[PDB]
Design a protein around this ligand. Structure first.
Ligand SMILES: [Zn+2]
Ligand SMILES: [Zn+2]
Length: 73
């Protein structure tokens, strides 16, 4: 399922993920496309920061969902 990750500079990154990916795996797919290290990414969805060890499925993320990226390190 394809999701959008919006940054503070207004960039909108399309990332195709698996519903079974952990949020840390999502950060890694973000790193493969854009080069931003996973350790510096805070991803927000449903008004809260997502935990690395939970799955997209755990947050009920769906096709077309928009996550927000804040840089943090
Ligand atoms: Zn997909
Ligand atoms: Zn927004």
């Amino acid at each position: 399922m394809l999701i959008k990750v919006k940054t503070l500079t207004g960039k909108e990154i399309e990332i195709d993920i698996e519903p079974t990916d952990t949020i840390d795996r999502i950060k890694e797919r973000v790193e493969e496309k854009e080069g931003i290290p996973p350790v510096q990414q805070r991803l927000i969805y449903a008004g809260k920061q997502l935990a690395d060890d939970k799955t997209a499925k755990d947050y009920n993320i769906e096709g077309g969902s928009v996550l927000h990226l804040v840089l943090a390190l």
